[PDB]
Amino acid sequence: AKVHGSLARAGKVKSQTPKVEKTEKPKKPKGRAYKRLLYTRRFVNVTLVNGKRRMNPGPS
């Protein structure tokens, strides 16, 4: 039941993670327009229906 483990490595992985900045991109619509986008994306633009539907495909 030791309580005096090493504390030197705290924050290691985070501090050594290669910093990359977010890529600026066009803003999404907010509110009723975004629900409109979701509706066309899932029910009108429906092209890939793997299983029943697919929502975040990986590259393949």
Partner: protein, 144 residues
């Protein structure tokens, strides 16, 4: 008659039997004993404040293997010593010693979380500043 009395005039027996047997329940026993106010680090409250006495490296329970980076805190309103986990990558650097910290339970109503042995509180704020705000760089600790 499968046990219990069924007479129209057996209300006293049934209510007393229920009173006797509600002591077998954890929540009813704790509430009626007032154990949160009496025997609990937080005196029944949701959060508490304390002073960091020392930084601890707690070795996590098997099969995990890690140093969990808790702090010993002395509560302002009680003087009781507790161990509080400091949640995030880093964030032990933000805590330091002799700093005031706002502690919370973790969600298991007592009952130490996960692989962290004997630790039932987590640091939420340090020096009046959210650990989340410090970890995400939204804000800074007041040095003076």
């Amino acid at each position: 008659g499968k046990g219990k009395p069924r007479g129209l005039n057996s209300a006293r027996k049934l209510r007393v039997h229920r009173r006797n047997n509600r002591w077998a329940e954890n929540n009813y026993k704790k509430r009626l004993l007032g154990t949160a106010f009496k025997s609990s680090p937080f005196g029944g409250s949701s959060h508490a404040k304390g002073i960091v006495l020392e930084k601890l490296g707690i070795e996590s329970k098997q099969p995990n293997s890690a140093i969990r980076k808790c702090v010993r805190v002395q509560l302002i309103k009680n003087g009781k010593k507790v161990t509080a986990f400091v949640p995030n990558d880093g964030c032990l650097n933000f805590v330091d010693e002799n700093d005031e910290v706002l502690l919370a339970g973790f969600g298991r109503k007592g009952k130490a979380k996960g692989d962290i042995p004997g630790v039932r509180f987590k640091v939420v704020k340090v020096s009046g500043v959210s650990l989340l705000a410090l970890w995400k760089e939204k804000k800074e600790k007041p040095r003076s």
